[PDB]
Point group: D2
Chain length 230, copies 4
């Protein structure tokens, strides 16, 4: 699967759910209006990405990169915020997934499937119980990230995320290039065959809360996956 949005236009290639909307300048707004309380937005590439193949046991490798900005509104504290994720094709927004559950986790499940790279702007009770405030986490089947690094969340600042999944070694690795010329990285060993079905969606889920809220605006997104085949 190969795609490249250098901007977003309604062209039938994406699937919006909840409060995700294409605002002009070709911005993917998640949510379109953060003043609405407790938004949940999904923005999925419109066809399934094969990530593994039953006949071969082969797993896909992929890279995706996206540039985005999270932004305060106006004196509200920021939440919740925005993820890139793989979920079973057929999954809708889960129940009991609002706010700090990022539109990807119910909350009560268990049970609960999903690989995510989260850009978490709000410290919940389960969050890197560090004094991390904002953080970049990798989630596997849990809102409690299996790894996470501090994120100097800067309102309106361009963040450039690159995520590589290497099927050979089963590593998901993330790098986020900040406007200040620094990078943050975090990685996690995940075998996609162990935790997800052979076809998933890829794309974003973003939430906000009330009074807590922020913009999650995605400016570009490229994605390349390859499943061998045999």
């Amino acid at each position: 699967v190969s795609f490249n949005y250098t901007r977003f236009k309604d062209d039938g290639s994406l699937i919006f759910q909840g409060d995700a909307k294409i605002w002009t300048d070709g911005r993917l707004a998640m949510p379109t209006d953060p003043l609405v309380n407790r938004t949940t937005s999904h923005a999925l590439y419109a066809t399934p990405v094969p990530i593994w193949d039953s006949a071969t046991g082969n797993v896909a490798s992929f890279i995706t990169s996206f540039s985005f900005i999270v932004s305060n509104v106006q004196r509200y504290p920021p939440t919740d915020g925005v993820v890139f994720f793989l979920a079973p094709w057929g999954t809708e927004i889960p129940p009991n997934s609002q706010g700090g559950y990022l539109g990807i986790t119910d909350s009560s499940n268990s049970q609960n499937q999903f690989v995510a790279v989260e850009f978490d702007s709000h410290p919940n009770v389960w969050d890197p119980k560090s004094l991390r405030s904002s953080h970049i986490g990798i989630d596997v089947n849990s809102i409690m990230s299996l790894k996470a690094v501090n994120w100097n969340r800067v309102s309106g600042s361009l963040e450039k995320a690159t995520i590589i999944y290497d099927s050979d070694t089963k590593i998901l690795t993330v790098v986020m290039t900040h406007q200040n010329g620094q990078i943050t990285t975090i990685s996690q060993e995940i075998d996609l065959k162990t935790v997800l079905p052979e076809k998933v969606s890829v794309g974003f889920s973003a939430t906000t809360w009330n009074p807590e809220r922020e913009r999650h605006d995605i400016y570009s997104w490229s994605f390349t996956s390859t499943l061998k085949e045999p």
Copy 2:
């Protein structure tokens, strides 16, 4: 922390919860009596194990070995498994953790936080949809193993586990030497410091169901952890 049980005595050094009992000949029985119905058994080292140190940021390495056997009773089908696990101190047998949730996962949560190596004798819907029947799995925060290998579960047969956590690369590795002299291995990169508090319990959880059950008898357990205070 360093201990070595060549057999088990009820000497205050372990905490037994639920159906865990010392049974004949210093065998740690989990459960003592599988005829009972659905059993959940915890046997934990009775002192919290320091796995990382907040001051220095150092993380413990460890090596642990245990030998055990799982046995059929009677003509019942086998379930559910026995796991070695680390969890935050204050860990109690969670609610909703019967059967396939192996006494460590609250099926109606979401907030499950533990690291386990599972010896899982019954394929649940969330189990490796490889065709694995029995399997050895590594779990973090989820009953869906991040990695797993299959297990030739042989009733009555001695299994010899060795698990190495290497804090330098943050890999948990498991080898199982089977009665036939073969070994099974599985590993997972896990940053202990990111998924668990400074002090954890180490020990075992095992469940049985109804009608599915089996014995899980632990014969020996040694553990060495070293945490750099510089």
Copy 3:
């Protein structure tokens, strides 16, 4: 360290050694002229890169991206490849590094010290005796790759490489997105602080042989690294 060459200017930001030169249309040619016969070319970022810090024991994370094309000349078979590499600052083109040694390995040593991602166009004796012909490899201290993946080398075809080093888990991961919309990835655990000194060059090395040769023309290159000071 942060830089981003959308093309290459003769601007003192790089060090060129051997046959490396800025060539037509702002491209980095390695070598500038393959017709010559055997070439070795180095093009290094001209400032040492700090990749670990003595006081904290911290290791740098980085992400680097570069677009490049390798091209046949015109009937010769291709050799030898181009690499992205880290080497001890003060690196010169090593003795005995011609041809398949990629300008990074002194073949009569032993003391070779470097981390490289190679795009190797020619199967030498030590190359994946898979039947791989061209391959993308991760090299540490040796010309024999620790991990390699097969590479559909297409003459004149644009390749877009991304390499992420995550200091958290110590994993170097490569993605190369090919013109056909496929990607190849390869990944390797590498502790930069075990294998390299605290200041390194980043850059490229490329060689051609006689008769075997090809162009390696790099079009763009961005690099962001972050080393923590506390």
Copy 4:
């Protein structure tokens, strides 16, 4: 391949090269006579170990333990080390492999093919630039350890090593339990299939120098490998 030496007898099960001999009480002495200057000793299991299989592409897993003591020679500084290593079946002590090269590396090459866990008693210039004196390293195709931890080398003190190779994740993990009951660990991702042929030796190499020397006495050694032939 499975074996277990609780002591070493002259039973033709191993292959001894250079100064490896069975010494008093079935100790494997490497060198037998540390008064000799610049000793090299190999002690290999005398049957190849299949570590991977061409037809299926599967890699073996293995677990191995051995206990050994390194001991000073009075008035002499200690060198150089003892290593557990895998090398192509048919491997011979390399030329130019004395002293710091541990009988595994030809210091004038290239091209050295092996995987080793070294117990290195003599800090060479290429040794971990940590301040380590003695250290336990993982070596792939280089004398310069891909990873290392430091070793509190104590003359005459029992060391208990456990090494697991997990073919699933491709990770070599070492634990070493010291006489004081602390453990040291170190791991490295190495896909044996990328670096070694199908059949390998497993065993030990040890060197001394002049005037530096020490005994490397091995007391016990067990090994279990399993290679999936489907």
